[PDB]
Design a protein around this motif. Structure first.
Motif, PDB file in Angstrom:
ATOM      1  N   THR A  55     -33.443  21.671 -15.905  1.00 15.38           N
ATOM      2  CA  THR A  55     -32.560  20.503 -15.849  1.00 15.38           C
ATOM      3  C   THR A  55     -31.310  20.859 -15.058  1.00 15.38           C
ATOM      4  N   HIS A  59     -29.886  19.220 -11.645  1.00 16.72           N
ATOM      5  CA  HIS A  59     -28.490  18.845 -11.632  1.00 16.72           C
ATOM      6  C   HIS A  59     -27.830  19.490 -10.413  1.00 16.72           C
ATOM      7  N   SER A  63     -26.585  17.643  -6.729  1.00 14.91           N
ATOM      8  CA  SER A  63     -25.181  17.704  -6.306  1.00 14.91           C
ATOM      9  C   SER A  63     -25.095  17.722  -4.769  1.00 14.91           C
ATOM     10  N   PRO A  87     -29.940  14.205 -14.996  1.00 13.06           N
ATOM     11  CA  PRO A  87     -29.099  14.810 -13.967  1.00 13.06           C
ATOM     12  C   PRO A  87     -28.666  13.840 -12.853  1.00 13.06           C
ATOM     13  N   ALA A  90     -25.495  12.294 -14.372  1.00  8.48           N
ATOM     14  CA  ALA A  90     -24.441  13.309 -14.472  1.00  8.48           C
ATOM     15  C   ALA A  90     -23.780  13.556 -13.128  1.00  8.48           C
ATOM     16  N   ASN A  91     -24.518  13.355 -12.042  1.00  3.59           N
ATOM     17  CA  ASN A  91     -23.937  13.508 -10.715  1.00  3.59           C
ATOM     18  C   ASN A  91     -23.272  12.219 -10.257  1.00  3.59           C
ATOM     19  N   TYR A 234     -20.706  24.578 -10.694  1.00  3.81           N
ATOM     20  CA  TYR A 234     -21.126  24.538 -12.083  1.00  3.81           C
ATOM     21  C   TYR A 234     -21.231  25.978 -12.573  1.00  3.81           C
TER      22      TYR A 234
ATOM     23  N   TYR B 234     -27.223  15.930 -21.735  1.00  5.42           N
ATOM     24  CA  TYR B 234     -27.350  17.089 -20.877  1.00  5.42           C
ATOM     25  C   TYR B 234     -28.361  18.012 -21.515  1.00  5.42           C
TER      26      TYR B 234
END
Ligand SMILES: Cc1cn([C@H]2C[C@H](O)[C@@H](COP(=O)(O)OP(=O)(O)O[C@H]3O[C@H](C)C(=O)[C@H](O)[C@H]3O)O2)c(=O)[nH]c1=O
Lengths: 369, 369
Positions: A55, A59, A63, A87, A90-91, A234, B234
Motif C-alpha cells: 500500500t 502511495h 505521488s 492511496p 491520500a495523494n 514519506y 491508511y
C-alpha cells in the motif's frame, strides 16, 4: 482445514533474523540493499525500491502522479483490496472507476479508453490473482487516448499478488510501467510486511528512492545539516528484518510458484465442462501466478457452503470498492462488474495442497450444490 | 568511536521473535495488542494505537485535523526531524512556522500565541531530545487564542525522542493532547521499526484505530464481503515482529533510561561554566529523557571537528526544516531560531557510555577548540 492462503516461511528465517537483531543495524542497512539487488536480478530490472508494504508502494508511486514534480483523477478498478485505491485519496486525487472485464477479473481496457481524459493523472491496473493484464493493449489504449495530451498519464501496475507472473516471457516490472509488488504475510514471497516498487527508468528510480525517506539524500552530510529537500517525501523504508526474511524466502519461492501453477493446470483441466462453473480466461502469451484460483459460479452462497462443509476454505476475498460510503460520489454503473460480483469466488490452489487435497476440491465441486 | 546513537536490543529478543515466526500469524495478531497494553500500562493511558513508524503516527494523527470527519494550516516547529512536518503536507494542509525558544530548542509559545488563527487546524509541538514542552502553558495559550473559534484546533505532541520523559510528575501521553511516539532503530525503546499514538479520549482512539487499517471495521465479515468503509484509511499497522521486539525491550528500557539521565546530570555539573558552551534550560517540574545531550557553542565546526579527533561523534541532527526548497513558500523570519541554528550541537549521552567515555567527552570539550 484446507486454507485459501498460507504464510510461506523458510526454516532459515529465525536464524537470519537473530543475526540482524544482534548486528546494531536495523534500518538503512546492507541486508535491505542485498535483498533489493536479488529481487532486481530476478525481475530483470535493477531499479527496485523496497518499502514497508505494498500500500505504501502505491502511495509512493501515485505521488508521481500528483507531484511529478516539485482536479486530477486516477482511473482504477473497484474489484481489488482497498489498499489498491485509498492511496489515490491520500495523494489528494479523485477516484474514477473503470469497469471490470468479466473474463479476466481485471480492468476492462475498452471502458478505460472511453474514460481517459485530460484530467487523468494516473491509471492503476491490478493483475488480479497474478493473472497479467494485456499490457500491449493497455499501452495501445493509453497512447490512442492521450495523443494530444502534452503529458501522458502515469501507468501503475499493482502487482501485489503477482510475484512470479510473466507476460510475453518476461517478469512484470520490465514492460515500461511503474510496478508495485507486495511482500505481505500471505503473498507467495513474504518479508513479513513489505513491498517494493520497480521503475522503468532512472529518473523515476531516483525520485522514488528520495521520496521513500522524506526526500532526504541519505548520502548527504546530515551531521552538519548540509542537505536540501527539494521534494517532500514519506517514511516508507523496509528494515533489516524484512530484507532478511525476503532473502531467505527468495531461495524457496520458485518451487512454491511451480506448485501453484501445477495445481492450477490441474484445475483448468478437471474443472472444465462442469455446469455452473465458469473459469477465467487463459492466454498463451502469459504465465499466471495463480495466487488463488478463480471461478465464476451460479448460486455462490450454496457453492461456498458446500465446499466449507467439505473442509475447503473459500472466499470472495474483497468487496467491490465502489460500494463503500467513503466513495459515494464516484459511484457509477459498471455492468461488467455487476455481472461477476455475486458470482466470483476463490478456491485454494497454493503450494500447501497435496495431491489428495487437490482431488478433494475437484471431487467436492463435482458433487454439486 | 564514541557514537551519538546506538541500537538497544535485549539479548532475549530472538526467542520471542522466533515464536511469532512459528505462529503463521505475522500481522493483526495478539502480540501487538499485548505490547500496546504494556505501553499503555506504563504511560498510564490505555488508548495506545501502534503504527509501523513515528512519521506514520503523525500522518495518521494529523488526518483528524484534515478530515474530522466523514484551506487549513498547521503551526509547527522547524527545529526537528523532517518526519515531524512532511505529514502536514501529505495531509494537504499548509505549514506555518512558529519560532523556537533558544533556551529549550522547543517552540516559542508566545510566538505560537500570536500566530493562532481561525485557519489553524492543528498545532504540532516537539519535545526535542525528550525535554518536555511546557504543556500547561501550551494549553493556556491555545485556550486563550481560540476562545470564540467554535472548534479548538488539534494539539499534537511529537514524543518521538521522549520515551520515559515525564512532565509535572506524569508521563507524556497523559496531558490531554494527541501524542505520537517513535520506536525506530535508535530510539531508546525500539521495535526495529515502529511507533504508537496516544489519545486523550475514546472517540479519537476509536477513529485512529479505524484509519490505521483502511477504514475497515475489523470485527466485520470480509470473507463474504459484508462490510462498509465510511472513512477511508491508511495501512499503518505494526506487525507481530515489531510487537515481539517491543515487549522484550520494554523489560530493559528503564535501566537504559536511568543511564541516559545519570550521564546528563554529570554533564550539567561538569560542563557548566565552560566559556563558549551554553547549556539548555532545566526546569524542576519535569524529568527530561536526554536522548542526546544539547549544547550551544561558538564556532561549531571547529567544535565538532575537535571532538571527532578524540573519537567522539557529534551532530546537528537535522537541518532547520524551514530552509528546505520544498517549503520555500512558508519561509518567514524566525529570529529565535536564527539565534541558535548555527550554534546547536549534540554530544553522546546514552546508555552505552562507560564512565571513562563520559570523562573523555568532558575532558575534550575543556581542552578548547
Ligand atoms: C538507523 C540506524 C542508525 N545507527 C547509528 C548510525 C549513526 O551514527 C547514527 C545515526 O544514524 P542515521 O544515519 O540513520 O541518522 P539520521 O539519518 O539523521 O536519522 C536518524 O535520527 C533522526 C533524528 C531521525 O529521525 C531518523 O529516523 C533516524 O534514522 O546511529 C545504527 O547503529 N543502526 C541503525 O539502524
Amino acid at each position: 482445514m484446507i486454507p485459501l492462503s498460507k504464510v510461506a516461511m523458510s526454516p532459515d528465517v529465525s536464524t537470519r533474523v537473530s543475526a540482524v537483531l544482534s548486528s546494531g543495524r536495523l534500518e538503512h542497512g546492507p541486508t535491505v540493499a542485498e535483498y533489493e539487488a536479488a529481487v532486481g536480478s530476478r525481475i530483470g530490472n535493477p531499479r527496485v525500491v523496497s518499502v514497508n508494504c505494498g500500500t505504501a508502494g502505491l502511495h509512493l508511486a501515485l505521488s508521481l502522479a500528483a507531484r511529478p514534480g516539485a482536479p486530477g483523477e486516477v482511473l482504477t478498478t473497484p474489484l481489488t483490496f482497498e489498499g489498491t485505491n485509498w492511496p489515490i485519496l491520500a495523494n489528494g486525487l479523485r477516484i474514477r472507476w473503470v469497469d471490470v472485464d468479466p473474463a479476466t477479473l481485471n480492468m476492462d481496457l475498452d471502458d478505460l479508453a472511453a474514460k481517459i481524459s485530460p484530467a487523468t493523472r494516473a491509471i492503476v491496473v491490478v493483475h488480479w490473482l497474478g493473472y497479467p493484464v494485456d499490457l500491449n493493449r493497455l499501452r495501445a489504449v493509453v497512447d490512442r487516448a492521450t495523443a494530444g495530451y502534452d503529458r501522458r498519464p502515469l501507468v501503475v501496475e499493482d502487482c501485489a499478488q503477482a510475484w512470479g507472473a510473466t507476460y510475453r516471457g518476461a517478469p512484470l516490472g520490465t514492460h515500461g510501467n511503474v510496478c508495485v509488488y507486495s511482500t505481505g504475510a500471505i503473498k507467495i514471497l513474504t518479508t513479513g510486511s513489505g513491498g517494493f516498487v520497480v521503475l522503468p527508468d532512472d529518473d523515476l528510480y531516483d525520485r522514488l528512492r528520495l521520496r521513500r525517506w522524506l526526500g532526504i539524500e541519505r548520502a548527504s552530510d546530515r551531521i552538519t545539516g548540509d542537505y536540501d529537500v527539494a521534494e517532500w517525501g514519506y517514511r516508507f523504508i523496509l528494515n533489516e528484518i524484512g530484507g532478511a526474511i525476503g532473502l531467505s524466502n527468495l531461495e524457496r519461492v520458485d518451487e512454491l510458484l511451480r506448485r501453484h501453477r501445477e495445481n492450477a493446470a490441474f484445475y483448468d483441466k478437471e474443472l472444465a465442462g462442469i455446469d455452473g462453473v465458469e473459469q477465467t480466461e487463459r492466454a498463451d502469451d502469459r504465465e499466471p501466478a495463480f495466487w488463488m484460483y478463480p471461478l465464476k459460479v451460479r448460486d455462490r452462497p450454496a457453492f461456498m457452503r458446500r465446499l466449507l462443509d467439505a473442509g475447503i476454505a473459500t472466499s470472495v476475498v474483497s468487496r467491490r470498492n465502489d460500494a463503500h460510503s467513503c466513495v459515494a460520489s464516484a459511484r457509477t454503473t459498471l455492468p461488467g462488474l455487476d455481472r461477476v460480483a455475486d458470482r466470483v469466488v476463490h478456491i485454494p490452489v497454493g503450494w500447501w495442497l497435496t495431491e489428495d487435497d487437490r482431488s478433494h476440491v475437484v471431487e467436492t465441486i463435482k458433487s454439486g450444490w
